[PDB]
User: Which sequence fits this backbone?
């Protein structure tokens, strides 16, 4: 057999994102769950890079976020992509849940 | 052997063999299933069985004569066989069946019983013979809306609407002296045949058959006939190949011999020097396969057919087979090219030097009708021995690499994936 | 009706196939989409990597 | 008569030789792209007159 | 023909994609900075610095 | 062999984790240990003096250095936890060995 | 992963030599008695690792009378070790019985796999 | 998950009533035409969910001439929605053909499962 089917680690990737059987008639409302996986990767990555410059003491916290926005190179891109990214994360989830509520995805066997 | 052609108004070809104990005489016409339309599809198959009907064959068996016939896409044949010292009677019988008196054969009683016999052959073919009907459906989707798509036996829907007048119209337009070759094989001298024809003043019909509007055109396509009650999956797959009178005729034939034919239950067929067999035998993906290179007047096909019971590993069989085809463009060894030279010569020697004069009469007439003469077997061996590794790579990069495909299948083919997952395997691009 | 009669596809078929006419216009778009995505996936990487360099108030005290 | 290899042959090392430094060098045809935006090696960034 | 060398391999084409993206960034940036500064000319600092040089 | 190779990756990530946390104390050994280790990457030809100023965030072990070492130090323990999952998956397909070094499929207990 | 064809190539040169077979054979007899597999009730060919195709082929072709006796020796050995004991001195394998029952089946599986590779990557005389 | 025994219990009370069957039957005929499953080439019994044992039992017992025709209607429907079109007006299901071909097989699978539960948890008369 192919190597992507016999290897312990690639077999999981093949079964999930390559050879997984899908219904032919699903529409673009079935694309919101992949976006929510990109949102989580955006939010986690941008947070690690801001956490290197942050201070959590109550007398230093507010002025540390301004230090990110003024002194850090490309720091205003990191923050605004983070603050607006969370509003986009919640809007795609309300659409994901309302989808399953319309097409009956909550019923048995799911 | 040595052939000899003439033209005294009638084209006469002959291939004498002094070692044979029989002699065959017949006539081959240059029209077949590809010279029909969908309304009269099967009219050439009825002329075969009218010639082989019981009251006609009884007249032959009283003088020691046996009859045969064969229908293909580009030609048709009507042969008479006899002992070597009785070939004068063979020509007289052929005279009162085509040149004269083909109305006693098309009586009402003889046409209804013959029709009922042909409707039962084509029905049992479509329900029991799965390898051959999947290869017919391949021609029907690859060449759709062109003459080369029609089946040679006909269909059950077009056969029922054929009357006697359809048989007579087809004969006036195609059974012509301009479209005919008289052949002779076995123990018969070339000059004894032509003088026998000159002593009778024969003439079938004069000439100028129809024009045939459209040419053959290959289209990438698929047709699936799923049946979950049958116990196997039968699949065929091909690309566009070489016609006859092509320069790459023998290079395409040699590239099919590199992958060859397989039977899982024969022990010696598991030991062939074919690299594809190291992948298939680990999990036993198939029962048999065979690679073909078919050639017609206008186009051709190159590919393979398979049958299997592993209905869950179909995608691995199609994948591994198409990755070997890629090697013909990238990496093909000199050893693989010398093996295929030797076995191809053995394959062509058995076809052309069999014992049957009836098979040799069909090969001779089809070749003379389509290029004017017949190539010797000693000249064909020299062409095969002059093929290099560079010639195979140039042919494959034109005909195989990143090219469209035709597919047909029947049986348990749920595991056969979509067109574009298979189309993508025709180019490596890990490269 | 018979399975050997194929249905009509004349409303979707290109008059002249030209084997390299669908092979030139299809692959030019798949190449352009990979060229822009390899440049966009790089400006992204070097934007995050450059945040870890010295800040404006550290270079001033150099 | 035989051929030199440990289950990958110089058959497809010297046929793969035009490829395995071109397809193998297809990853610093990637270094044209992979390695700017920084003052690391500006000797070899802006040297082309398009650049 | 064109397809047998433009993109036949993808060592032909992942190297042409990558090499062509490096040249794209430079040519693309210079064209945007020239349009941006000319659309807002007279308001930038270099124009103000050239009007007080008395 | 694949189980042994994922283990060597765990060992590398655990040396890294322990080093970064010893620097979060900022004692006298914590400051001068980061000095002599980060200055070893200055010997790499043609990129040595640029990766050291990028690790430090400046021109010496200083405040950007300690704030980024703490944020990386919380992260890497969660990468180790994912290497451990991959490590167990490679053990389940063949199982464990035994001190005799022969097959164990003849005598098994749960 | 040294082949058995190579081990016997070296060994048969030592044994058929007069001067070499008197310095290395006494050394090799003390090496086997200090190892201690005979005290667990094992022959040497039981210790060979079997997670490879050449050893899976040799074990399929082993006769069943000898295959049933091998499985009992291996089960008895796993149980003598879970208890941290040795077997009685009259149940030890003796030197007469410590024979290579599996070596001949291995050497013919190796000579056939090598013959196949030499043919799969041959170049032609022409 | 309302049982079909209960649906027909209510429905047959409405239909055999003179005054009730003239206010709710016209309402129910407009409800079916506005739903639009007949325009995709579907009958109502194709829409019933089948991921439960009472519906798996009814489908095994369905004759095969009717089972082969059901699978074609379902495949044709997935393809018609994939293209965002409707079928031609002469391929729509008509009201004569919209018959409950699967209802009788369902009601006998339900009456047998209820009979079994009443016997599995019965108490004795003594
Ligand atoms: C921030 C993230 C952005 C993305 C979020 C939204 C994406 C999911 C929305 C679902 C959707 O696609 O809207 C369709 C919806 C219901 O209709 P349906 O499901 O039956 O048909 C789907 C068919 O596959 C279309 O796609 P179609 O098959 O018709 O053609 C392909 C289409 C590609 O367009 C897109 O990229 C759509 C994302 O071709 C073009 O448009 C070419 C451009 C000229 O009818 C509507 O139009 C409603 C619009 C959405 C309003 C609700 C949200 C407001 C808060
Ligand atoms: C606790 C959590 C509660 C969560 C509730 C959150 C509510 C806010 C969520 C906003 C998104 C809601 C949109 C509805 C999505 C469900 C799926 C859906 O409605 O699509 C099917 C519907 C039918 O039309 P089709 O032609 O596509 O037919 C296909 C099947 N019949 O196709 C359609 O999409 C209908 C056409 C588009 C309607 C757009 C109207 C505005 C929707 C609200 C958006 C937000 C406020 C403006
Ligand atoms: C699901 C993932 C996350 C969500 C939904 C989320 C949400 C938020 C929100 C809404 C804010 C306030 C934004 C503002 O108005 O400024 C914030 C701030 C912050 N978050 Fe995140 N966050 C996520 C992940 C992370 C992670 C993993 C980290 C650390 C590694 C992080 C670090 C920070 C920091 C340092 C701030 C303060 C700086 C700022 O205000 O932007 N975040 N987060
Ligand atoms: C967080 C670190 C680790 C964890 C949690 C872990 C966990 C485990 C567990 C539960 C087993 C099975 C039981 C056992 O054999 O004791 C195992 C086996 C094994 N581990 Fe680890 N391991 C770790 C690190 C390592 C490292 C650093 C190596 C080598 C460099 C390694 C190599 C192996 C091997 C070879 C085995 C199989 C031994 C056998 O079956 O005989 N592991 N590990
Ligand atoms: C229905 O068909 C589908 C389907 O369509 C899809 C898309 C998926 C896959 C869907 C997903 C949503 C994927 C899942 C994604 C996650 C669970 C995200 C989790 C991982 C992350 C968020 C990445 C975390 C990142 C890090 C640990 C590193 C970040 C920090 C860095 C790089 C700094 C490093 C330090 C220095 C100094 C450089 C399916 O599984 C599936 O089912 C078959
Ligand atoms: C972003 C946070 C990371 C969390 C996700 C973890 C992914 C890290 C990958 C680690 C690679 C481990 C390699 C060590 C073993 C090498 C020996 C070997 O032969 O094994 C390797 C295992 O390789 C992988 O694990 C990568 C698969 C993707 C995993 C998706 C779940 C053999 O498999 P593979 O084919 O992938 O590697 C050769 C490539 N041709």
Assistant:
């Amino acid at each position: 057999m192919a190597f992507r089917k016999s290897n312990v680690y690639l077999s999981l990737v093949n079964s999930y994102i390559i050879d997984s059987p899908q219904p032919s008639s699903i529409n673009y409302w079935w694309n919101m769950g992949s976006l929510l996986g990109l949102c989580l990767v955006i939010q986690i990555v941008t947070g690690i890079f801001m956490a290197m410059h942050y201070s959590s003491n109550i007398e230093l916290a507010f002025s540390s976020v301004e230090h990110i926005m003024r002194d850090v190179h490309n720091g205003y891109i990191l923050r605004y992509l983070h603050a607006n990214g969370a509003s986009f994360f919640f809007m795609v989830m309300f659409m994901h849940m309302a989808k399953g509520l319309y097409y009956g995805s909550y019923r048995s066997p799911r | 052997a040595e052939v000899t052609q003439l033209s005294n108004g009638i084209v006469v070809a002959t291939e004498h063999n002094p070692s044979a104990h029989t002699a065959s005489v017949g006539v081959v016409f240059g029209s077949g299933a590809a010279n029909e339309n969908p309304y009269n599809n099967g009219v050439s198959n009825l002329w075969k069985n009218i010639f082989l009907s019981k009251e006609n064959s009884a007249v032959a068996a009283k003088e020691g004569l046996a009859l045969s016939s064969n229908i293909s896409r580009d030609f048709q044949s009507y042969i008479v066989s006899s002992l070597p010292g009785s070939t004068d009677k063979s020509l007289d019988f052929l005279n009162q069946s085509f040149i004269q008196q083909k109305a006693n054969l098309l009586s009402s009683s003889n046409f209804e019983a013959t029709k009922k016999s042909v409707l039962k052959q084509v029905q049992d073919f479509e329900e029991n013979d799965h390898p051959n009907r999947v290869l017919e459906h391949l021609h029907s989707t690859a060449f759709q809306n062109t003459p080369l798509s029609l089946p040679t036996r006909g269909t059950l829907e077009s056969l029922e609407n054929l009357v006697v007048a359809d048989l007579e119209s087809f004969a006036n337009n195609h059974f012509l002296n301009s479209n005919a070759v008289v052949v002779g094989t076995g123990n018969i001298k070339h000059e004894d045949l032509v003088n026998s024809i000159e002593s009778k003043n024969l003439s079938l019909q004069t000439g100028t058959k129809p024009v045939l509007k459209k040419k053959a055109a290959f289209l990438g396509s698929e047709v699936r006939l799923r049946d979950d009650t049958l116990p196997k999956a039968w699949i065929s797959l091909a690309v566009e190949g070489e016609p006859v009178n092509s320069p790459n005729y023998f290079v395409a034939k040699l590239a099919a011999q590199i992958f060859g034919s397989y039977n899982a239950f024969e022990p010696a067929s598991r030991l062939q020097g074919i690299k594809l067999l190291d992948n298939i035998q680990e999990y036993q993906l198939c029962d048999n396969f065979n690679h073909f290179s078919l050639s017609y007047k206008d186009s051709g096909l190159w590919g393979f057919s398979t049958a299997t019971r592993n209905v869950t590993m179909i995608d691995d069989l199609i994948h591994f087979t198409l990755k070997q085809w890629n090697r013909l463009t990238i990496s093909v060894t000199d050893t693989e090219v010398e093996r295929a030279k030797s076995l191809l010569k053995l394959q062509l020697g058995q076809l052309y030097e069999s014992g049957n004069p009836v098979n040799d009469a069909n090969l001779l007439g089809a070749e003379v009708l389509i290029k004017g003469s017949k190539l010797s077997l000693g000249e064909a061996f020299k062409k095969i021995d002059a093929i290099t590794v560079k010639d195979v790579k140039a042919w494959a990069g034109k005909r195989l690499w990143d090219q469209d495909i035709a597919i047909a299948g029947t049986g348990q083919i749920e595991g056969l994936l979509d067109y574009m997952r298979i189309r993508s395997d025709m180019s490596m691009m890990r490269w | 009706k018979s399975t050997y009669r194929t249905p009509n596809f004349d409303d979707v078929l290109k008059e002249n196939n030209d084997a390299d006419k669908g092979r030139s216009y299809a692959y030019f778009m798949v190449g352009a989409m990979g060229l822009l995505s390899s440049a966009g996936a790089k400006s992204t990487v070097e934007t995050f990597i450059s945040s870890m360099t010295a800040t404006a108030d550290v270079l001033a005290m150099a | 008569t035989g051929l030199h290899f440990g289950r990958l042959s110089l058959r497809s090392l010297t046929a793969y030789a035009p490829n395995l430094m071109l397809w193998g060098g297809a990853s610093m045809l990637g270094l044209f792209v992979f390695t700017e935006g920084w003052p690391k090696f500006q000797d070899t960034l802006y040297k082309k007159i398009p650049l | 023909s064109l397809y047998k060398t433009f993109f036949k391999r993808n060592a032909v084409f992942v190297g042409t994609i990558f090499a062509g993206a490096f040249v794209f960034q430079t040519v693309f940036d210079t064209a945007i900075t020239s349009w941006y500064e000319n659309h807002n000319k007279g308001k930038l600092w270099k124009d103000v610095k050239a009007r007080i040089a008395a | 062999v694949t189980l042994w190779n994922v283990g060597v990756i765990i060992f590398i990530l655990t040396i890294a984790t322990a080093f970064l946390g010893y620097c979060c104390v900022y004692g006298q050994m914590s400051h001068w240990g980061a000095t002599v280790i980060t200055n070893l990457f200055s010997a790499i030809p043609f990129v040595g003096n640029d990766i050291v100023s990028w690790l430090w965030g400046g021109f010496s072990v200083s405040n950007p250095t300690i704030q980024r070492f703490f944020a990386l130090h919380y992260l890497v323990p969660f990468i180790i936890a994912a290497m451990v999952i991959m490590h167990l998956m490679a053990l389940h397909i063949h199982g464990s060995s035994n001190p005799l070094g022969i097959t164990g499929n003849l005598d098994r207990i749960p | 992963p040294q082949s058995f064809t190579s081990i016997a190539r070296i060994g048969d040169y030592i044994l058929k030599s007069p001067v070499l077979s008197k310095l290395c054979v006494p050394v090799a007899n003390q090496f086997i008695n200090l190892a201690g597999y005979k005290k667990l009730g094992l022959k040497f060919d039981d210790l060979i690792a079997e997670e490879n195709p050449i050893m899976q082929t040799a074990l399929r072709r082993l006769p069943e009378d000898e295959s049933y006796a091998r499985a009992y020796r291996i089960i008895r050995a796993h149980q003598t070790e879970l208890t941290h004991h040795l077997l009685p001195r009259n149940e030890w394998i003796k030197a007469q019985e410590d024979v290579p029952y599996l070596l001949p089946y291995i050497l013919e599986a190796e000579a056939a796999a090598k013959e196949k590779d030499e043919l799969d990557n041959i170049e032609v005389s022409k």
Remarks:
- Residues A 40, 43-44, 47-48, 50-51, 54, 65, 79, 82-83, 86, 89 surround protoporphyrin IX containing FE (ligand 3) (CB under 6 Å).
- The CA atoms of residues 5 and 27 of chain E lie 26 Å apart.
